[PDB]
Ligand binder design. Structure first.
Ligand code: ZN
Lengths: 189, 512, 124, 103, 78, 49, 99, 49
RNA sequence: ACAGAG
DNA sequence: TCCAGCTCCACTTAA
DNA sequence: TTAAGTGGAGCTGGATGCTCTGT
């Protein structure tokens, strides 16, 4: 479900690390700058996948470190629209249902895309669903959060960059839907 | 011309879009260029440049010529881009002289840029079906009958023709065919025996091929020039006197240059038969009018002859100088008030004048006149002569004669107009873009009514439209429309000022 | 840092399983130094991704299992985004094919859908 | 305190009534005594108002309005044929147009 | 083939010793067996005489082409 | 600062600059005339310059 | 005395000194005698590494007033400087790190 | 040029500035790539005609 | 601004 | 205290 | 006869060494 992103960078290798093969030292110094961070237009970087090319290791004047331009590919969790995923409920809230996908927690099920039978919680945090035959409106998305299946209808990037001179909002947002048949808790289908 | 290029950028974006306004503005700003560097200076791909250039040449907005070594150079026609703004006034004035068929002819010619005579009579017939009902078709005969009347009156004219390759230079194909204008056949229509009917949108080899036709924009300016002169005479003298002027100008139409100081003289003996039969005036009283017009110091008419009875000419250049001055004085009056407009007409008649004579002559005191004088310098309505006593040019020993120059103040005022329209468009587009949220929302509710209008459409959908939360919002959309309708209407009305000022500037230039 | 291709390839979750397992074989032979939080970011994202994938049915697969899965599914007129989803989630009921494949009730006949159920569960 | 220039060369022969010191800058949009002339109305000046708005809505739909091409669509799907933006294409007259502009 | 002179110029010698001294001042591995020297530039001069310096000199021709010469394969001289 | 009273320091003039160029001493001329006088950092916008 | 000649092409520099010169033939031609009063002021930043750690410790212990000594000490990723006249120098010598 | 390099604080081209130094690291350029398993061309002939 | 020193 | 450009003005050729 | 291109003469603006050492 992931993608590769082809990226370039100039990596500074300091001179105490000259006792190590360069392809090992470069990869470590790249994971330290990319892992668990969102790169704006492309998504959340998991780790470096491989180095595809490695240019000349210049030494610039006034420093002793070596600078080398690296060509590399990185595994990034970018899910395409209308994809099916499975994940666990962390919380119920008035604004909707919040889903976790392992590492990723900013998954929104909006109430405009929830199941139609029940749509306004009666002063309760937990969301509800009513079926006439079974369960009299007490069926619920439990706080323990047994895995739901959801379909990612929308995603948005918000540019979390400094405004004004210098001297926490979620930068990657994902919006699901659950209204289709076959979506929901796994035990329902 | 930074105001012109800013205004041309908006017009091309609204009528043609983003990847062609880039090429259009670049041609206006840099002048003529070969094709390869138009792409490179812009970063557009070569296929998009060809698409952009071919649409700008279709609507007659760029010319092309062959040069040394056979390269084509394109060249933008800046003034012809600005005349896209006057298009509704053209479509209205054809509806005044001609029926609704003549309105739809000019609309198709202006929107497609060039059309063949077979193509226009087709598309006018197709569109006039919506104006009629109960079986009656539009037929191609009554379309052409107005087109050939448009042609004789010179509102529509043939485009520059491709040359005959077989007669001239047979052989290797040229990079561009080096088009030329023929003076004989501009107003000579092809004869068409084919007739037919317009299709009512049910949805369930060509003889005049290459005879393209386009609107003759210079003929509309000769119409609008007449209306400015005729209406000025209607105010100052009388409606009867205005008709005498309208009679002279309508005869002048076919036999005079669109740029000349004087038209062909006409005798009062031949004016008499040309005036409509309802004007219960004797020939002797007709000569009373003509002398009292010629006595006027505004000199809209003059004598210029004595043969065949009384001979009279109407002055084209001197009427425009009056109208440009009346335009120039009217903006002074509204911006700074009547007492300042007094001083503007004072200095204009007392061609060079000093402060102590201004307060004496206008009966405006000091500390009120001088404040008005010094503002008119700083808005470039008025000038200083500064005759020196000595080659020091020192301020203590020179007499600061004021002057009004009409030509420079007309060029200055025209520059204010181009930026004024650009601002009005910028306000409309800002309020349209920042309400795309509500405009989509008000579309989608109306889309539920438009889509599935009749087939299977139950009555159970007519109340669910106002059930959305857009019903309180509606107050904003009434504010939107009243804003846009005032901004659009002001964008039309400032064009009345441009045409008066530009026609004066156009005639004083000899372009030698 | 500059990006030369945003979307380059689609990855199965088996390749990420194989990547992080090969990563784990050579990680944690040196600990975090706390000269910078950079090592903390790498550990938390690697661990939580694999703990997610280890609860997905992508385990026990292999390169020759995945390659032959495409070979069997080659003849079925499915796009990449549909073949990818059938691999990663292991469908066993009929309903999620209408989710994972658009207009499946129009493109695939009921016998073709039930052949697709068997093609998944016999190979995977 | 005196300046570099002599103030008597500018003016101020009496020795008083120097202009005051501006404390706060003047506002960006100062108030004006005069107002715009109200617009012209009529049955003819309003028909030009409606024809002007119909030329925007038409010339955006006509084939001369070359829209910018889209790019970097992520994946292919079966909703591509259902969502193909169909529009007919205009063709020029390549006699008048130069040879250098064929697509 | 490489057309430029095989001798190390005084400017190449000055900057190799400088860049190596700055690298030995930071905690880089020393390739020679040092013998109680403390001054980084003196250690770099032993590495030059022993031909152990890991620097490549990229000679630049004015058209933009280049030649990569090893410090160990230039002819050093006083 | 300018001199002994103010613990001023010494000048690398336009003539001493001409000497160091003739040695080809590019880094020493950078150390003397930037690093040990007036080294600074500015924020430069790459868009407007 | 303008920018381009007075402050840009040439400029006042620190770590500089001036004194009267006098002969000494017992020095080699590549040597110059520097007085102790200038040598105690003109400092050189020696970066701590494996070859000089035990040498610089003795210099830190002597401190500012004895000639083979040191005036300042600066920590690895810090840009403030500890003036070594105060504090106990035998503690600051023990806490030398590489870098 | 030399004079504007001293003004702007960048090392002059002449002298020791004419050449660049590369570090002789033990590196393998164009290293062995990880094969993709899924998104290879032979299994993904286009759907549309 | 002047005097010095090399 | 010494020295290149810029502009004004007479001075022949040419139609 | 005069339009014009080029000579000769006067006006204008620029420049004139490097540092410390004191009042
Ligand atoms: Zn900026």
């Amino acid at each position: 479900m992931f993608v590769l992103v082809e990226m370039v960078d100039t990596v500074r290798i300091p001179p105490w690390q000259f006792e190590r093969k360069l392809n090992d030292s470069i990869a470590e110094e790249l994971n330290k700058k990319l892992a668990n961070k969102v790169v704006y237009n492309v998504g959340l970087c998991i780790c470096l996948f491989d180095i595809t090319k490695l240019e000349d290791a210049y030494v610039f004047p006034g420093d002793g470190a070596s600078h080398t331009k690296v060509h590399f590919r990185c595994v990034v969790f970018h899910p395409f629209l209308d994809e099916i995923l499975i994940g666990k409920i962390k919380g119920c809230s008035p604004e909707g249902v919040h889903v976790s996908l392992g590492f990723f927690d900013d998954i929104l099920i909006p109430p405009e895309s929830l199941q139609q039978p029940a749509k306004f919680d009666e002063a309760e945090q937990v969301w509800v669903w009513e079926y006439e035959t079974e369960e009299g409106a007490h069926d619920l998305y439990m706080d323990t959060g047994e895995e739901i299946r959801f379909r990612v209808v929308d995603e948005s990037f918000v540019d979390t960059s400094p405004t004004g001179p210098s001297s926490k909002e979620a930068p990657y947002t994902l919006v699901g839907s659950i209204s289709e048949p076959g979506l929901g808790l796994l035990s329902w289908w | 011309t930074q105001a012109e290029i800013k205004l041309c950028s908006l017009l091309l974006q609204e009528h043609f879009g983003e990847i062609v306004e880039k090429i259009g503005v670049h041609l206006i700003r840099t002048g003529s260029q070969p094709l390869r560097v138009i792409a490179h200076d812009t970063g557009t791909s070569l296929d998009q440049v060809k698409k952009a250039l071919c649409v700008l040449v279709q609507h007659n907005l760029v010319s092309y010529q062959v040069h040394k070594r056979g390269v084509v150079e394109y060249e933008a026609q800046c003034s012809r881009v600005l005349r896209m703004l006057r298009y509704p006034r053209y479509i209205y004035t054809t509806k005044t002289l001609y029926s609704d068929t003549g309105e739809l002819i000019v609309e198709e010619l202006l929107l497609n840029g060039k059309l063949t005579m077979s193509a226009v009579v087709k598309k006018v017939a197709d569109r006039l079906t919506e104006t009629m009902e109960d079986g009656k078709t539009m037929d191609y005969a009554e379309v052409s009958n107005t087109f050939v009347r448009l042609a004789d009156t010179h509102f529509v004219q043939r485009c520059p023709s491709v040359p005959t390759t077989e007669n001239s230079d047979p052989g290797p194909p040229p990079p561009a065919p080096t088009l030329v204008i023929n003076e004989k056949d501009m107003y000579l229509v092809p004869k068409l025996s084919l007739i037919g009917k317009g299709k009512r949108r049910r949805s369930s080899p060509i003889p005049d091929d290459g005879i393209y036709w386009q609107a003759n924009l210079d003929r509309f300016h000769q119409h609008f020039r007449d209306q400015a002169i005729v209406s000025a005479v209607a105010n100052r003298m009388d409606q009867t006197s205005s008709e005498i002027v309208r009679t002279m100008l309508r005869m002048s139409e076919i036999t005079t240059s669109s740029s000349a100081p004087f038209t062909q003289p006409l005798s009062s003996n031949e004016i008499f038969r040309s005036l409509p039969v309802g004007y219960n005036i004797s020939k002797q009283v007709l000569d009373q009018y003509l002398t009292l017009l010629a006595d006027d110091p505004l000199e809209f008419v003059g004598k210029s002859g004595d043969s065949g009875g009384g001979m009279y000419v109407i002055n084209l250049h001197k009427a425009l100088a009056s109208l440009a001055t009346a335009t120039l004085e009217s903006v002074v009056q509204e911006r700074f008030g009547s007492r300042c407009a007094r001083i503007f007409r004072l200095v204009l008649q007392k061609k060079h004048i000093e402060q102590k004579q201004v307060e004496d002559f206008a009966m405006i005191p000091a500390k009120e006149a001088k404040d008005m004088l010094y503002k008119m310098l700083s808005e470039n309505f008025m000038s200083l002569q500064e005759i020196p006593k000595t080659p020091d040019h020192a301020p203590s020993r020179t007499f600061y004669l004021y002057t009004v120059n009409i030509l420079s103040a007309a060029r200055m005022l025209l520059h204010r107009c181009y930026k004024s329209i650009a601002n009005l468009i910028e306000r409309r587009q800002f309020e349209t873009k920042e309400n795309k949220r509500l405009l989509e929302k008000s579309q989608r509710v109306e889309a539920i009514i438009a889509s599935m209008q009749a087939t299977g459409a139950e009555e159970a959908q007519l109340q669910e439209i106002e059930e959305m939360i857009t019903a309180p919002e509606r107050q904003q959309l009434e504010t939107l429309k009243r804003n846009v309708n005032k901004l659009d209407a002001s964008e039309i009305q400032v064009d009345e000022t441009i045409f008066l000022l530009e026609s004066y500037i156009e005639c004083t230039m000899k372009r030698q | 840092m500059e990006v030369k291709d945003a979307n380059s390839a689609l990855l199965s979750n088996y390749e990420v399983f194989q990547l992080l397992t090969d990563l784990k074989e050579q990680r944690k032979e040196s600990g975090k130094n706390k000269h910078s939080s950079g090592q903390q970011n790498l550990n938390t994202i690697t661990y939580e991704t694999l703990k997610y994938i280890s609860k997905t049915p992508c385990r026990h697969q292999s390169p020759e299992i995945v390659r032959e899965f495409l070979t069997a599914l080659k003849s079925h007129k499915l796009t990449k985004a549909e073949k990818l989803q059938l691999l990663n989630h292991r469908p066993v009921t009929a309903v999620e094919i209408q989710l994972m494949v658009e207009e499946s009730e129009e493109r695939l006949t009921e016998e073709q859908i039930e052949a697709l159920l068997h093609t998944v569960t016999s190979i995977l | 305190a005196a300046y570099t220039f002599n103030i008597e060369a500018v003016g101020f022969s009496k020795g008083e009534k120097l202009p005051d010191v501006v404390l706060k800058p003047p506002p960006l949009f100062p108030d004006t005594d005069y107002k715009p002339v109200p617009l012209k109305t009529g049955e003819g000046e309003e028909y030009m108002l409606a024809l002007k708005q119909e030329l925007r809505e038409t010339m955006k739909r006509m084939p001369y309005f070359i829209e910018t091409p889209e790019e970097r669509q992520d994946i292919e799907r079966y909703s591509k044929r259902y969502m193909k933006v169909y529009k007919e294409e205009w063709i020029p007259d390549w006699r008048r147009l130069p040879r250098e502009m064929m697509p | 083939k490489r057309i430029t002179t095989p001798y190390m110029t005084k400017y190449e010698r000055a900057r190799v010793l400088g860049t190596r001294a700055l690298q030995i001042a930071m905690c880089a591995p020393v390739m020679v067996e040092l013998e109680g020297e403390t001054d980084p530039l003196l250690i770099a001069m032993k590495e030059l005489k022993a031909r152990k310096i890991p620097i490549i000199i990229r000679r630049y021709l004015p058209d933009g082409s280049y030649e990569d010469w090893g410090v160990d394969e230039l002819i050093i001289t006083d | 600062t300018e001199g002994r009273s103010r613990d001023g320091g010494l000048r690398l003039g336009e003539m001493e600059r001409d000497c160091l160029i003739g040695y080809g001493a590019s880094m020493l001329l950078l150390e003397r005339l930037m690093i040990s006088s007036d080294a600074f950092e500015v924020d430069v916008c790459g868009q407007c310059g | 005395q303008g920018r381009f000649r007075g402050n840009l092409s040439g400029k006042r520099v620190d770590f500089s000194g001036r004194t009267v010169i006098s002969p000494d033939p017992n020095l080699r031609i590549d040597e110059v005698a520097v007085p102790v009063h200038v040598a105690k002021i003109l400092t050189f930043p020696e970066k701590v590494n494996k070859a000089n750690i035990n040498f610089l410790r003795k210099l830190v212990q002597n401190g500012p007033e004895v000639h083979p000594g040191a005036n300042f000490i600066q920590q690895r990723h810090t840009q403030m400087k500890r003036f070594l006249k105060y504090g106990n120098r035998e503690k600051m010598a023990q806490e030398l790190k590489y870098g | 040029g030399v004079s504007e390099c001293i003004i702007m604080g960048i090392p002059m081209n002449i002298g020791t500035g004419l050449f660049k130094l590369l570090h002789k690291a033990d590196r393998d350029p164009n290293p062995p790539k990880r094969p993709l398993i899924f998104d290879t061309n032979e299994f993904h002939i286009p759907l549309v005609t």
